[PDB]
Paper text:
The architecture of the E4 megacomplex is conserved across eukaryotes, but species-specific adaptations allow [name] to perform its precisely tuned quality-control function in diverse cellular environments.
Screening additional peptides revealed tight binding to an NRT motif, and the co-crystal structure captured specific contacts with both the T2 side chain and the N-terminal amino group. ITC binding studies showed that the second residue is more important than the first, as an NLT peptide also interacted with the ZZ-DZB domains but NRL, NRR or NRA peptides did not. A threonine at position 2 is characteristic of many processed mitochondrial proteins, for example identified TnSSBP1 (NST) and TnACADS (NFT) and previously co-purified human proteins such as ABHD10 (NKT), SARS2 (NTT), ACOT9 (NLT) as well as the Dengue virus protein NS5 (NGT) binding [name] (36). The pronounced preference for threonine in position-2 points to the targeting of processed mitochondrial proteins, eventually leaking from mitochondria into the cytosol, as can be now explored in vivo.
Numbering used by the authors: 2 to 125
The structure:
């Protein structure tokens, strides 16, 4: 998924995909996974600083039938199988659970939303 509203203090890319790493010493300081894994530093930040990984995991509810307990992977498998042609408006549970996440991503094609905005790869 994307870290909406977040930009990397080292490479300046924003709303980046993959995992987000937040420094717990420097104020409002975040690294994309590429800059985190590669030891990127700026003026105030060192690789010694404690970092918190944000995003990933979680169990999700299907908005079309209400069944609970899916992972991001199994939710997408379920929706793309059992609800691929429906036009009811629903709100995305994954966006709402991710910090920065749109609290209300309203969509009438949830299967396309998962495929496009929640791709199933660790770096995405
Ligand atoms: Zn970066
Ligand atoms: Zn730092
Ligand atoms: Zn369902
Ligand atoms: Zn979403």
């Amino acid at each position: 998924s994307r870290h909406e509203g977040v930009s990397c203090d080292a490479c300046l890319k924003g709303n980046f995909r993959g995992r987000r790493y937040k420094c717990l010493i420097c104020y409002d300081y975040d690294l994309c996974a590429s800059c985190y894994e590669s030891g990127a530093t700026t003026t105030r930040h060192t690789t010694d600083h404690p970092m918190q990984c944000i995003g990933g995991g979680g169990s999700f509810t299907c908005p079309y039938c209400g069944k609970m307990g899916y992972t991001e992977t199994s939710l997408q498998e379920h929706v793309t199988s059992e609800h691929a042609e429906t036009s009811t408006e629903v709100i995305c549970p994954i966006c709402a659970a991710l910090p920065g996440g749109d609290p209300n991503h309203v969509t009438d094609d949830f299967a396309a939303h998962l495929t496009l905005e929640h791709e199933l790869r660790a770096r995405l």
